Paper text:
The alg operon also encodes a periplasmic lyase, AlgL. The structure reveals that AlgL adopts an (α/α)5 toroid fold with five pairs of antiparallel α-helices. Our in vivo studies demonstrate that AlgL does not associate with other alginate biosynthetic proteins and functions as a periplasmic homeostasis enzyme to clear the periplasm of accumulated alginate to prevent cell lysis.
To investigate how the H202A and K66A active site mutants might affect enzymatic activity and account for the discrepancies between in vivo phenotypes and in vitro catalytic activities observed, we determined the structures of the AlgL H202A and K66A variants. K66A and Y259F retained approximately 1% and 30% catalytic efficiency, respectively, compared with WT. Although K66A retains enzymatic activity and the strain does not demonstrate an in vivo growth defect, some cells were observed to display aberrant cell membrane phenotypes by TEM. However, residues 66 to 81 within the lid-loop region of K66A AlgL could not be built into the model, suggesting that the lid-loop region in this mutant is flexible. Similarly, we were unable to observe any corresponding density for the mannuronate substrate soaked into the crystal prior to data collection. K66 interacts with the sugar ligand and appears to contribute to loop enclosure in the WT enzyme. This could explain the abnormal cellular morphology observed in vivo in the K66A strain and the reduced enzymatic efficiency of this mutant variant in vitro.
Numbering used by the authors: 28 to 42, 49 to 65, 82 to 362
Write the structure that this text describes.
């Protein structure tokens, strides 16, 4: 049967157009900060602008908004943007993040019970082929790695692929994302830690928290296509999630494991707990987990397709 997203992505619509950043067709050889931000400017201007044009069409229904979202994505699609075989770790990291954001947003157009795309067949097909080509490329980018190398980058890659899988109806890509999810569930030790993110020393809590959104989104998407991943490695996802919340409350447990006082800069912002939306859709959340969900809504996370609250509701 055809791959589907969670119920929320079938939401009805409602219920000019700036010039498109030059499509990035270059080699993806970037610097991992002011330099980095500048090298990836057209990619950043794309991922934010397209997502916000989708968001605003889904809210407003105005038919110019749709035209503009599809002109933006189909320009990049038609041009073969981010397809290069010349890449470094940072450029392949950028390919998958951009796939992640744009496919996550376009999902709402693709599956809305309004059928916005019924009028835009050609441009829609240009965009789905582009996402499938990028999805096939991401798979190559993060395959044949030993456990020592499999970390947050592989998890977010697996989400970008899953998002692509459902948009393009590609079971090959679905299956890859589920396997990657399985590897990641197995990385979760008896205590709910990921050894590789324990290497991040003072950032190990932040990086543990950064792993939950991709993994929870993959579990949410797998479940609506009949693949329940909630009990993987004795409920590893729930084990990792619980452990992350004990840590954000009480830092000490991570300081004890890493021997290091934890930087709480990336546990500050509300966007960074958006994983509570798909997680509490999957697991019976306790009042400490539902309260953190209640007070920070509604979540906007570009990297997950924008309005995450609206699609888990």
């Amino acid at each position: 049967a055809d791959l589907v997203p969670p119920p929320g992505y079938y939401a009805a619509v409602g219920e000019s157009c700036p010039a498109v950043p030059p499509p990035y067709t270059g080699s993806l050889v970037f610097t991992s900060e002011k330099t980095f931000r500048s090298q990836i400017k057209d990619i950043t201007d794309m991922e934010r602008g397209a997502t916000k044009l989708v968001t605003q069409y889904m809210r407003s229904g105005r038919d110019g908004d749709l035209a503009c979202a599809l002109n933006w994505m189909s320009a990049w699609a038609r041009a073969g943007a981010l397809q290069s075989d010349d890449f470094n770790h940072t450029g392949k990291s950028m390919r998958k993040w951009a796939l992640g954001s744009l496919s996550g947003a376009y999902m709402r157009l693709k599956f809305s019970s309004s059928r916005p795309l019924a009028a835009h067949a050609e441009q829609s097909r240009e965009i789905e082929d582009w996402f499938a080509r990028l999805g096939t490329q991401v798979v190559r980018d993060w395959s044949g790695l030993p456990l020592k190398k499999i970390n947050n980058h592989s998890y977010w890659a697996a989400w970008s692929v899953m998002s692509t899988a459902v948009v393009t109806n590609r079971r090959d890509l679905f299956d890859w994302a589920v396997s990657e999810f399985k590897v990641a569930a197995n990385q979760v030790d008896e205590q709910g830690f990921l050894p590789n993110e324990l290497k991040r020393r003072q950032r190990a809590l932040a990086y543990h928290n950064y792993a939950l959104p991709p993994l929870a989104m993959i579990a949410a998407f797998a479940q609506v296509n009949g693949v329940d991943l909630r009990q993987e490695n004795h409920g590893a996802l729930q084990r990792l999630a619980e452990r992350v919340m004990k840590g954000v409350d009480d830092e000490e447990t991570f300081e004890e494991k890493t021997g290091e006082d934890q930087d709480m800069t990336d546990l500050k912002v509300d966007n960074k707990y958006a994983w509570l939306e798909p997680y509490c859709a999957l697991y019976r959340c306790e009042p400490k987990m539902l309260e953190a969900k209640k007070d920070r809504e509604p979540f906007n996370s570009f990297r997950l397709g924008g309005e995450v609250t609206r699609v888990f509701s």
